[PDB]
Design a protein around this ligand. Structure first.
Ligand SMILES: Nc1ncnc2c1ncn2[C@@H]1O[C@H](COP(=O)(O)OP(=O)(O)O)[C@@H](O)[C@H]1O
Ligand SMILES: [Mg+2]
Length: 755
């Protein structure tokens, strides 16, 4: 009798239907006799009879729908059970605090070799199932960890890596994380430890299924962050870890000071993450005036001083020598000092510029740290070669300085990722388990090239999700004659082609612009609109429903009609953001550095960022399409980074946008485990007496399952394979186990049953 009906902030609320009208149901909220509200018929769902129970697999619910799924994960979350299955897919709700012992070495050991469902839902069980599938099927595997910014993708990715290396090893793969996060993570409004690059981490195994090494692929490091941030955000953690934690000897060698002293840090938040203890370990000369007034930033995970110490320990553990450590820090400090080089107008018509007299020290420190001559650096930032050496305007000098900073830092990040790969190499491997941790679809008031690339990535990955979860799965069910109700989808190749098609795609049109004598963002934007006037996925910014886009000219942006939502991209800076290469004069200044480390970072100048990413993404998709896939859907419970605060409407929105709601019936009515009658019969054959061997493979399988007490609630026979339903992984694993004693025992049971 009680049903779930909409609620503005909780998503759904309990009530009883008291009336029906055209396209409406009248709902009486539970225990509020007399009070009523209207709800659309299609927005009212049946509720589970027992409101207090919780199930480990949502497929176990009598009435699985968006409302009962939300309630089940809510009840579990209230009891610190953050992990729940939907058959073999895992839902992980971010707790925003450390739940005691759930990631301990004892917990890790408890998950080893256990069938899904034998143990409580956990990220370790997804990792173990991928390992078991890898070993049994002799097929590499991918674990895709998805969700909103701050949902827990990076934390769950780290739990998977720790589980696999601790269980199936003979520590560097785990130890590499603090190093990569130092250079590629930063505080954003949505996450204090936001990943500003995407990654695919592979753990490689030998023929005995033991760890031999790893490989990290990195994507789209955010360059804009290097030079300026929003007042509540920070630059990359490394800058603050260095300022908070460096010894006075290092501070002096690098000419470091409190973060408020650097243009590249001082528009963002200049405070450190610290607690009462670590704040006393940070020296007074590292603290900005805002830190001394407002106090430290608080986080349960991050600690700038503590993290610097842990990073140095990680560097030692991985084999990074003390010399390489200082080489990395010198580049980081060189980029900070570069940012302090300021310019002033020069010329009777302000056509040129000069370094401000106050910037003399910054020029000196920067040149010293980057191994450059002060004069060549000053000249390269204030003039342009076209031979002919002409003055730059102040705005152009600021751009040249910032371009050099962004390129040096991005090359340093490429160096760090490569150095980490060199710490766990392998000459050969039989298979791998790869973990994908990349940002999904996102949009803000202002969307630029960074959002354009991430949303393009999302179109391609969404297509992979559709092809694997819906297309391939249902084609198997249909071919096998299973009669599973079909879930349809609309393919997005038209959106992918708009962005990436050769010659006509937006990325190619943008590259065309970078190669022109006088590149222009406006010329690029007009070329897109002119080429794609008939494309239903593209529109001018004036077509938008929002007031913020009313002033955007046709050549100043474009709208992409992604199925996830229409996004208006402002095209200013698309041409500059699309170039990974430095101008020839800055490139030569940096390639000719006195410092070997600097020359080694760099060992018409144009490298397409868009097409570099397209090639990388295609290599990633080649790997995903050729491996088995497991999915973890991370959920962010609130926008306040707080524990025990479940925002039902926000969580419901994520469950809907992720596509999880659209597949609930397909997963519940699906068959995640299967084997052919032939492979089963062939495995048992040698143990069979004649009476069993004489049976056709399908008939032997039927006798085996009946003897073991299995029924239609556990399995269904297809044309060539047996299929096991959700919540039947343990039963399937028993049938599949190839140990001679185990096979002989099951045959003994079948022989006894048959009599
Ligand atoms: N299972 C977890 N246990 C403890 N804290 C967690 C857990 N998952 C996430 N967090 C917290 O949430 C923050 C954001 O998680 P994160 O993995 O960085 O998000 P994402 O990578 O999806 O942007 C973490 O820095 C941490 O404070
Ligand atoms: Mg992350």
């Amino acid at each position: 009798k009680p049903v779930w009906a909409p609620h503005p902030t909780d998503g759904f609320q309990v009530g009883n239907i008291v009336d029906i009208g055209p396209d409406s149901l009248t709902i009486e909220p539970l225990n509020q006799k007399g009070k009523t509200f209207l709800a659309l018929i299609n927005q009212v769902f049946p509720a589970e009879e027992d409101s207090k129970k919780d199930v480990e697999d949502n497929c176990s619910l009598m009435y699985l729908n968006e409302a009962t799924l939300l309630h089940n994960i809510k009840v579990r979350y209230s009891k610190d059970r953050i992990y729940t299955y939907v058959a073999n897919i895992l839902i992980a709700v971010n707790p925003y605090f450390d739940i005691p012992k759930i990631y301990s070495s004892e917990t890790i050991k408890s998950y080893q070799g256990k069938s899904l469902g034998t143990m409580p839902p956990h990220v370790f069980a997804i990792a173990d199932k991928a390992f078991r599938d890898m070993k049994v099927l002799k097929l590499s595997q991918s674990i895709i960890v998805s969700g909103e910014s701050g949902a827990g993708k990076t934390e769950n990715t780290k739990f998977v890596l720790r589980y696999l290396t601790e269980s199936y090893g003979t520590d560097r793969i785990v130890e590499a994380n603090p190093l990569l996060e130092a250079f590629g993570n930063a505080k954003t409004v949505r996450n204090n430890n936001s990943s500003r690059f995407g990654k695919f981490v592979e753990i490689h195994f030998n023929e005995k299924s033991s760890v031999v090494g790893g490989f990290v692929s990195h994507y789209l490091l955010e360059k804009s962050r290097i030079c300026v941030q929003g007042k509540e955000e920070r630059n990359y953690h490394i800058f603050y870890r260095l300022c908070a934690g460096a010894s006075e000897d290092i501070r002096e060698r690098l000419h470091l000071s409190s973060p408020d002293n650097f243009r590249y840090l001082n528009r963002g938040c200049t405070r450190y993450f610290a607690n009462k203890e670590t704040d006393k370990q940070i020296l007074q000369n590292r603290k900005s005036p805002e830190y001394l007034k407002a106090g430290s930033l608080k986080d349960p995970l991050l600690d700038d001083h503590g993290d610097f110490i842990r990073m140095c320990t990680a560097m030692k553990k991985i084999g990074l020598d003390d010399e390489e450590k200082l080489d990395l820090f010198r580049v980081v400090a060189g980029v900070l000092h570069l940012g302090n080089i300021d310019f002033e107008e020069a010329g009777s018509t302000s056509g040129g510029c000069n370094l401000k007299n106050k910037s003399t020290q910054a020029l000196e420190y920067c040149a010293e740290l980057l191994g450059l001559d002060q004069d060549d650096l000053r000249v390269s930032l204030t003039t342009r070669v076209m031979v002919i050496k002409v003055p730059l305007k102040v705005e152009q000098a600021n751009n040249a300085r910032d371009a050099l900073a962004k390129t040096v830092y991005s090359h340093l990040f490429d160096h760090v990722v490569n150095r980490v790969n060199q710490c766990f190499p392998f000459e050969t491997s039989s298979y791998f388990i790869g973990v994908l941790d990349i940002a999904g679809f996102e949009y803000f008031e202002h969307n630029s090239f960074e959002q354009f690339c991430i949303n393009y990535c999302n179109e391609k990955l969404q297509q992979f999700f559709n092809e694997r979860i819906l297309k391939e799965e249902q084609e198997l069910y249909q071919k096998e004659g299973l009669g599973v109700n079909e879930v349809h989808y609309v393919d997005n190749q038209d959106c992918i082609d708009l962005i990436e098609a050769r010659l006509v795609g937006i990325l190619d049109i943008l590259d065309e612009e970078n190669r022109l004598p006088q590149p222009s963002d406006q010329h690029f934007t007009s070329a897109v609109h002119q080429k794609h006037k008939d494309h239903f996925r593209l529109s001018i910014p004036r077509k938008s429903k929002l007031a913020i886009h009313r002033n955007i000219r046709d050549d100043e942006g474009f709208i992409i009609r992604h199925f996830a939502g229409a996004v208006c991209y402002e095209t200013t800076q698309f041409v500059e953001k699309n170039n990974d290469a430095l101008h020839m004069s800055l490139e030569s200044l940096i390639c000719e550095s006195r410092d070997k480390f600097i020359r080694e970072l760099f060992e018409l100048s144009f490298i397409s960022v868009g097409n570099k990413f397209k090639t990388q993404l295609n290599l990633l998709l080649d790997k995903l399409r050729s491996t088995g896939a497991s999915f973890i859907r991370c959920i962010k419970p609130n926008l306040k980074m707080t524990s025990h605060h479940f925002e039902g409407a926000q969580i419901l929105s994520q469950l809907q946008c992720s596509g999880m709601v659209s597949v609930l019936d397909l997963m519940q009515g699906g068959f995640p485990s299967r084997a052919s009658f032939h492979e089963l019969y062939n495995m048992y054959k040698k143990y069979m007496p004649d009476k069993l061997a004489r049976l056709d493979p399908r008939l032997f399988c039927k006798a085996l399952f009946k003897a073991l007490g299995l029924n239609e609630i556990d399995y269904k026979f297809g044309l060539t394979k047996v299929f096991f339903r959700p919540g039947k992984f343990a039963e399937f694993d028993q049938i599949m186990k190839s140990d001679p004693d185990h096979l002989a025992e099951l045959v003994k049971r079948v022989n006894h049953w048959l009599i």
